[PDB]
Ligand binder design. Structure first.
Ligand SMILES: O=c1nc[nH]c2c1ncn2[C@H]1C[C@H](O)[C@@H](COP(=O)(O)OP(=O)(O)OP(=O)(O)O)O1
Ligand SMILES: [Zn+2]
Lengths: 277, 180, 277, 277, 277, 277, 277
């Protein structure tokens, strides 16, 4: 009911040599850089507001606690972006990034499009470390700006720290992305029409990501394809610790789960990215 | 109207560059006087000469500076050739020992559009004459004999001098990179 | 920062005598009828699937655990609707409903529109107990069907048990309502343009309810009203146990919180509905 | 106020050598193949219905007269597609297509994406004539189907005759495309975020094409770019006979008009496509 | 014609023990923290734009070269603030700040108001290092925000990096401050009515600072005080390398020059701040 | 729509214990000292000019009738100041000032700044009666003069009788203060950035006071704060007899009205100042 | 990115025949009269003060070195005006002015308003040479003085040598003009509301000229005109040697640059003024 690493490796080679495999990188991909995930941010927002971090967690979800933070005082969200920029993109996080085996194995492949939902320059920065060049696309001005001819386009799906208007963190910013009208939303839905995705270090907790894969099946089911042909183009979900409910929800959306070895999280991902080559 | 301007106060360099790049309608001519820095390296002086001539005329400018590195003087004058021919006119043939007369005639163009300085360098092997001979040309042309040739730059005409001199290879490189 | 019962009582009388107050009733309004809330359903779905009810709860949210239930076997969702109908609308739940002080105090007022998100006939059934007559509107055929002239229209916002196609319980049914295109969605957004609402027994946990109040502020903020005039038409949120984060999120959406006495939940609601009269 | 051919030629070379120019081909591009435009179809639909072709034209627009045709009898639209197949993709239209100077000049360039709104295989067929290979993408199954690595993707924006469910001709099919949810709609809106378009043989009469360029400016104006930077990425509209109103409407949407010589329509287009090379 | 360190020391003790001395700190005060001054920023802006740093300097003044940078591309100023945040407020600039003798000698005194024109947290950060607490005031929301009772207010006169809308760097932002209507402008002009200032590490090159001291003399000369009484309240300008023209311009504005020893810039400032105690 | 005395008392205690409450005293604060208000001056100017006091009132406003008085003869304004000094600061007005309950309740609090618009020494004289010491600041020489360390600064906003050049009474002197360039104007606009004010005995009839609160909202509205945060810092307007129009004009400027009991004007003010303690 | 002479010639004819073109003449317009520019004055001020002219230049800007000159001794500025009058308006500068081709081409056109920033009678003197009559307006008494009916008004924007109080040369006189309250300032800002200007021989180095064009865009941007209509009324800047930064700064302010031939400065200007006719 779940692919292993050796089973999923010839399936990922076929989609990569056809140029139809696109990585989707989450907050767990920057975990070996000693960065906060979605839980250590809330522990830092609770310290500023005067909450204990265990009491602040039980008043709402991740989107709702950041919405409460941003309206506590004026200019409270601007300060967070400034603090995150100094902590996420620091020089000691740069130094952990050249010697990271996941970021080396990611940049060794010749991708054309990479999607990320984290606010750090460590995915395009991994491509600059390997001598390659990348193109960060986050806002409308980036898509219409000049690029080079054949350069890997890194789509910052949730925003970048050097453009603080593009960061979606609060609940009102997730509701603004439910219209699927932002330039990262329109680019994602067109790439999903034709490409397989590889989710690495990401857990489907964002209700706007799950809503995009929902509405791709409304195109898939209305097109009245067979049992054989509607199940042909799959997406892949590499996860150490998926539960018992979530892999069966995603089978509806043509998403297969690749079970990685949970003893060493960083080496299991790196062996997956080296098996694509 | 021109888009590039060749700046020189030397009216003998002006008739050389107008002999080949003269029919180009995209090249103008200015006569601003600049002051060079004290260094024997040609690359250093021509690069500091373009920043000092753009500051004077404030248009995309092309400047020119040369070198006469000599083996017997361990590379002297280098880009210090302007005060040698003023001081040692034809005694420069006499201060150099007979038997090791070999030298290099270097020359450099540097064009500055206001944002970038690009240096083009050509170079001609040769040897200093035992005595100054020839009437044509200008400064230090009666003393330099190119390799293979027996005659000086002064003994040759302007078509024949530019088939040996560094400027005859710098016309085509300046025309191609600027579209003149 | 929070209205009491005596403070909110003259504010609710003014909107009721103008005919511009509409109740919005949740799952806590049927709690004195000994019915399951959103947590005792999941305890019943876990028993059918073979889960322990505490282990089944930590694999996903309420929408996602019901999506996992409905795809476990064919005809598994229809069985749930049949079971719910026998338990929610049973004869002993009818007998607890005439002697309930909340349902008597609700039906004593002369409403014109009532919205509910629960699958039981105990809101229109409370109106039949008081001699009044109601009109259940759940699907497209109900809105175009014949009614009487001046009859309280009960809008089953999430569906009714006698029309099992209208029940939104699973995650795919909540995503289908994100388009705001269903007939209860279109009727709600037009009533929200002109009326104050009174949330009784409901907690804002549905991301499609919160998205409707989100997009009413996008009309409110784009209309460029003043500080005084954009804050004039309020909605009211009666809750015994609202936390510390959620009342400040809803102040953005012109929703005021009415703090009820948490010692007796049923009598606190009944004194609120009697203060409107 | 309008570019000429020699003025627009260095602007089209710059966008083509960067790989950011995409042709958009209309019904006037298949006019030298002796095919009907939008007016000779209506003259053929009026003959079947028993109308005089001048009396049938004054009862509605092009979308509405085809909607009236399709509901006159059962299977009346299926017959039209069959008839169009016989006349648009006939062997004598193939023979006029190799010796057409526009189709030779189009296929001489190394495009990557071509959009068309006409129902004929004469744009991808022009690429097969030049030894190149193309990939027709019209439906959801085409986007998820297998292609080769670097092949020009021809996006049949309004449908293809070999897939009759994809043809949008009637008014109800244009209203179904107003949601911008079809796979050619989603691919167009993502390519418009990053690329210049070249409209050849097309007149903006489709209210779904004009609505896409409308909503790209709602992204452009909300992004609050300057006067200089919001006017940088242009689109180009080659037309022999644009009026006095329509070029000023399209200046709002960053669409520049290239005035072609109206004495010979086919040679003016061919000199434009040869000036890009 | 110029005060020495021992001559100016009893004049600074008298104004400090009366509570009427306010420091004004410039870009040279953060020079021992290895930060750029106004010339190394322009060397960094020229590298991004593709200029040589000596050619870029001769096309305009400091305000005008930053105005040219900010309009070169969209979001070009936002990136600069992000980069400055990473380099000005880095952890190695924090570590040089505790062992800096100027920042220790500044925080040893019990100030009430400090003005700075540099975008870094190293003046209020020096007060946090000495156990004291500070209050950064940069925007309108900071002045109306809550503070404590007796806390040194650090007025970021040109803006702060955590509030990027307050940074005045380009020429258009200096012209917007010529109206003297910003909250740091209004607070400065009222403190100048009653207090002596001490300029440390600042050179009068900003034409809005010089315009404020200009218009204080228009109040001083119109009030028709004597020769003795109009020259009583002085300001002090500690500078290693003031020229021959600028000290006589500032004598008009009651600004006295304190000549510091230019052999060691950091130790000369530290002996001045220790002589006030 | 209007605060009472008991409602506004905890709001004034909070701003006073933080040191952010500043009294603003008008001509009605010196009414129990049997002094003229703005109407009995005009009755005295009409007697000198030979007018009947009811006929002189209908030829212009208060500013314009004093402008007509000052240009009737040379040295006519100097005489008025002399007469006002003998009447306003007389010994029998001193004797009514120690036994006045408002002036005792004002001096019992430990203020730091007091603004007045009346020409009499009865606000700083009330502080001398309670053993405290005050510092009158009216002109440019007062702001740069020597004070003590922690002494309540009484800002004579419209001038003092012992400095007759500072008195603004005529229309030309109000127009000279429209530039907001005087030292009381610059000190007021900087204190308004950070402090709540309490208007006692003052009615907003001066068009230069209303223009200062106008231009503080132009800073407040351009800073784009929320509905919640732009309404946080309020000012307070204690008045027995405010009409129906003026309290709603001042709600724009964050000024709340405190309704005092109009039966006894002196005792209502004294109970307000005792409730702050 | 820069207009040539033949491109700008039909644009200047259209504004001139409508009477909406006004010349703005700088110090380079009097350069063929062998007069000092802004650099040869400073070489003459350094000789009087005892400076070497290269050492005096590096102690401040042009405004600041003249401020240092004027306060070196009493009556030092009066002497400069006397010396300038004898040199600028000498008889040999008159004789070079009739045979100057720029001054003949300027006076051949029928202007109505001419602005100059130089202290010499060679712009109105050029109009007297062509038989026309001019009206010099420099001070308040000139604007209210008598003129004739239709006579070209020459606005001496920085002053005239026959009225030495109007000359703005020192830094304190430039700061006095920052209020934009002088009669040449008020006349310029009203002519800029309705007219195109032609800058000849002037380089934007005066921070009060740049501040006027700054605040015309604050009216232009607040009026919320479109992209098309806010860019309609242009100003023109004829310059032989504009750099790389300054033409892009002035595009913000609707100022277009006309590149003149730098080989002969006088003949390039004269061909521009003859192309307007
Ligand atoms: O190809 C050459 N063939 C013969 N003589 C040359 C050549 N190239 C430079 N020379 C002479 C000229 C000058 O005496 C010295 C260079 O010094 P140089 O600074 O470039 O001459 P310059 O100051 O008079 O004119 P410019 O303003 O263009 O620098 O060596
Ligand atoms: Zn030279």
């Amino acid at each position: 009911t779940t692919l292993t690493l050796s089973e999923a490796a010839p399936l990922l080679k076929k989609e990569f040599r056809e140029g139809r495999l696109i990585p989707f990188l989450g907050a767990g991909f920057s975990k070996p850089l000693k960065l906060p995930d979605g839980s250590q941010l809330i522990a830092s927002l609770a310290k500023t507001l005067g909450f204990e971090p265990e009491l602040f967690d039980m008043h709402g979800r991740f989107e709702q606690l950041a919405e409460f933070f941003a309206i506590s005082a004026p200019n409270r969200l601007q300060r967070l972006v400034y603090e995150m920029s100094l902590s996420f993109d620091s020089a000691e996080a740069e130094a952990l990034r050249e010697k990271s085996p996941m970021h080396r194995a990611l940049a060794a492949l010749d991708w054309r499009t990479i999607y990320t939902t984290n606010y750090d320059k460590h995915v395009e920065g991994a491509l600059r470390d390997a001598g390659k060049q990348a193109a960060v696309l986050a806002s409308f001005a980036d898509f219409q700006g000049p690029r080079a001819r054949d350069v890997c386009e890194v789509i910052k799906f949730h925003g970048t720290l050097d453009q603080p208007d593009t960061i979606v963190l609060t609940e009102s910013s997730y509701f603004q992305r439910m219209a699927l009208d932002a330039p990262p939303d329109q680019r994602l839905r067109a790439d999903l029409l034709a490409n397989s995705f590889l989710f690495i270090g990401y857990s489907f907790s964002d209700t706007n990501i799950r809503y995009i894969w929902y509405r791709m099946n409304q195109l898939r089911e209305q097109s009245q394809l067979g049992v054989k042909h509607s199940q042909a183009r799959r997406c892949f979900f590499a996860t150490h610790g998926a539960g018992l409910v979530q892999p069966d929800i995603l089978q509806q959306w043509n998403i297969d789960v690749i079970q990685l070895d949970p003893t060493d999280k960083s080496a299991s991902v790196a062996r997956l990215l080296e098996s694509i080559a | 109207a021109p888009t590039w301007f060749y700046n020189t106060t030397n009216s003998e360099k002006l008739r050389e560059l107008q002999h080949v790049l003269g029919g180009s309608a995209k090249l103008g001519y200015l006569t601003a006087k600049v002051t060079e820095i004290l260094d024997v390296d040609l690359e250093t002086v021509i690069r500091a000469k373009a920043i000092a001539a753009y500051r004077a005329v404030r248009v995309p400018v092309i400047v020119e500076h040369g070198a006469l590195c000599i083996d017997a003087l361990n590379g002297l004058p280098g880009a210090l050739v302007k005060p040698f021919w003023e001081s040692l006119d034809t005694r420069l043939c006499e201060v150099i020992p007979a038997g090791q007369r070999t030298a290099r005639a270097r020359g450099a163009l540097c064009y500055c559009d206001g944002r970038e300085r690009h240096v083009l360098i050509e170079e001609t092997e040769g040897e200093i004459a035992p005595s100054a001979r020839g009437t044509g040309g200008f400064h230090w042309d009666p003393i330099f004999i190119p390799k293979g040739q027996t005659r000086t730059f002064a003994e040759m005409s302007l078509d024949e001098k530019l088939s040996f001199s560094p400027l005859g290879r710098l016309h085509t490189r300046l025309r191609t990179e600027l579209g003149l």
